[PDB]
Amino acid sequence: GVVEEWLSEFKLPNYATKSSLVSSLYKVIQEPQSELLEPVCHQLFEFYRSGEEQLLQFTLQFLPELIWCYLAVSASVHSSGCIEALLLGVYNLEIVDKQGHTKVLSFTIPSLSKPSVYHEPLSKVVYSGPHPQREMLTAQNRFEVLTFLLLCYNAALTYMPSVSLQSLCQICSRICVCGYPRQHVRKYKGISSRIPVSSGFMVQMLTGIYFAFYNGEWDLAQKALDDIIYRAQLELYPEPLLVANAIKASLP
Amino acid sequence: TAVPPYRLRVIAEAYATKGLCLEKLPDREQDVITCYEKAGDIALLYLQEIERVILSELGFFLETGLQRAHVLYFKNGNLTRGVGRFRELLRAVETRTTQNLRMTIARQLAEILLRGMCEQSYWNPLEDPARVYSGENIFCPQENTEEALLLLLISESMANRDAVLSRIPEHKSDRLISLQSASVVYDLLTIALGRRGQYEMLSECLERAMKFAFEEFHLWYQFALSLMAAGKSARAVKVLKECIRLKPDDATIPLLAAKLCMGSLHWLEEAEKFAKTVVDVTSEFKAKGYLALGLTYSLQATDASLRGMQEVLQRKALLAFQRAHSLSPTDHQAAFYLALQLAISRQIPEALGYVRQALQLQGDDANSLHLLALLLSAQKHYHDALNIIDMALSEYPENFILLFSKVKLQSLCRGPDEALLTCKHMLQIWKSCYN
């Protein structure tokens, strides 16, 4: 119960910089049968008011595990419904709360004809934003905010340790195979249902998995890629199939 | 400056001899690092002098002695030093004789700049984390994607002119090397560009690369998939047919061709041919082929003109649907489509049971709830259908067909005032959704 002592001693900027705090958090979050889930989630959300990155990055890496747990337990059972509050709040603060204005992600397209810095012989394109503020979760816009939050999580890949990558790969392996005989072949036990994923979510999933291929995790990433390509082939989704096919033929 | 070339030759020989002697034996490490640094500096001076003299043939020691340096830097983990060295290498004046090596380093940068850092781990080269090109009209890199796309574009443009044109008189090795280089650079380009959801320029680039492919499945398949994802149909269908001709082994390609044929293009015979080809050849694929054949038969039956063939096609579609259901009992889509097809023949209890089973498999489908309400309407139970439509509207408060069904049911059951209110709410929703 080290988390209890941490909460007691908590209730200045050098609070963070514990060796085994992440292990304790994973131990207490790996199952839903806990009694302090609500206060600890309140503290999780409170870790986000401060503008320093050393706390946001310290608390961001736990999202995939709780996302999987909430999306699997509910789709079956008691549901807390307070994790959706944290998800909606972080979505709102990442979509509006920067200085009072929204986010419009855009960049330019370099042209070879115009002389460049490295070579001599551009219209703005928006891929994300603006997103209207969301305050309730339904069965139509959930995947949009999930994809946006995953894209936000896929912005600081260097900082998180290998445990987060392993957990992400483990979740990715069985998230898209839960309702087919292939998971019976792979000998997975749990909820025998299916989840109607979207194309953009799988594309961001491929983007996330491709980085971990050369960072120690090899077999797990390969199996996850096989699951992704099998699911896309069965569901007839063009873009993830194209990306996976491109990735497959680029391995030594 | 003003140094005879033989002094450069003898000092290069001395550098090579020192490099050979250092490795052949089991602080001085800093001396070795400084020797490598001065070797790099004299290499820069040598390349500047040679480009000057040519501006007005065997590189054997400089290449290894300069590349293995940053190879060992990467082995130890001095990423910042290596990337800074690469940045200052790319700033040199281009040389026509070195273009090939340029390719390498450029591609190498494209390999590392996409998998080794994040946005907040980027810094301007002018601060810590002779003639040099400068000016104000130069394109200063802003993000990783920007400079990555720029490097890939220049590499592709410079590699197109160096193609061997598939000479193939008697030898094959050079063409194989060129094809491998083109394949890897185009794969890097498509993985870099496809992440942003920009497809048409990818189609254009694959069209440009189409010159090399003569009997290669990979390039044809990538081009077909990119074209189909872009939005074009006829070209996608033609390339799908060509890919089918090339290798008749898989079933995904004919299934995609049938899906495109059955789509907005509104063709039926080609979908039938593709479905028959699929069913001619595990167990899931043949079930999907049967489902596609049944859907095609139903669509053909809808647009008939006389009596008998309508019943014939309805019976054929029902047989195909029941065969598909028998081959695989763990898919809700097949059961839902079977119930929908059966409801046409007015056989109410059986369709109700089948749609109940489909709801049992999965009950979050909007189409399933809509079909359930529509079927309950035929049994003269208006309040139950009204509640079902209300719950469906609660789950999907921005649909259109469910709103029309609700308006019709309210007009038939409650009164005109509720229909007027629903219509004005629908007008308000439409006004809000558009401009």
Cα–Cα distance list, A24 to A18, A39, A166, A171, B152 (Å)? 10, 15, 17, 20, 45
Q: Does B195 touch chain A (CB under 8 A)?
A: yes
Instruction: Please count the CA atoms within 13 angstroms of the CA of B206 that sit on its side-chain side.
Output: 26
| Residues sharing a CB contact under 8 Å with residue B145, sequence separation 6 or more, in sequence order | A107, B192, B196
Collect all residues of chain B within an 8 Å Cβ-Cβ radius of residue A144.
Answer: none
Q: Are strands A105-107 and A125-128 parallel, antiparallel or unpaired?
A: antiparallel
Residue B259 contacts A, CB cutoff 8 Å:
yes
* One-letter amino acid for residue A228 of the chain: I
* CA B254 vs CA A57, A229, B87, B93, B244: distances in Å: 47, 17, 48, 52, 7
Please say whether the beta carbons of B371 and B388 come within 8 A. Answer: no
Distances B364 to A140, B62, B120 between C-alpha atoms, Å: 11, 67, 42
CB-CB neighbors (< 8 A) of A247 in chain B = 191
Name every residue whose Cβ is closer than 8 Å to that of residue B96 and which is 6 or more positions away in sequence.
Answer: none
Chain A residues close to B117, C-beta within 8 Å: 158
CB pairs under 8 A between A and B: 107
CB contact under 8 A, A116 and B138: yes
Which residue in this structure is represented by tokens 């629908």? Answer: B426
- Token readout for B189 is 């380009």
What is the Cα–Cα distance from B46 to B52, expressed in whole angstroms? 10
Residue among A105, A212, A196, A194 nearest A148 (CA): A105
From CA A48, how far away is CA A124, in angstroms rounded?
A: 32
Interface check for B150 against chain A (CB to CB < 8 A): the answer is: yes
Nearest to B152 by CA among A116, A198, A27, A181: A116
CB B188 within 8 A of CB B107: yes
Q: In this structure, what token pair is assigned to residue B176?
A: 């194989």
- Technique employed here was cryo-EM
Å resolution of this model?
3.5
Provide DSSP, A107-153.
Answer: E----SSS--SS------EEEE-------S--TTTHHHHHHHHHHHH
Structure token digits, residue A100: 């009072």
Task: Tell which residue, A133, A249, A194, A108, has the closest CA to residue B364.
Answer: A194
Q: Which among B119, B139, B194 is the nearest to A155, CB-wise? A: B119
- Tokens representing B299 are 């669509």
Helical segments of B200-264, H only: 200-209, 217-230, 234-246, 252-262
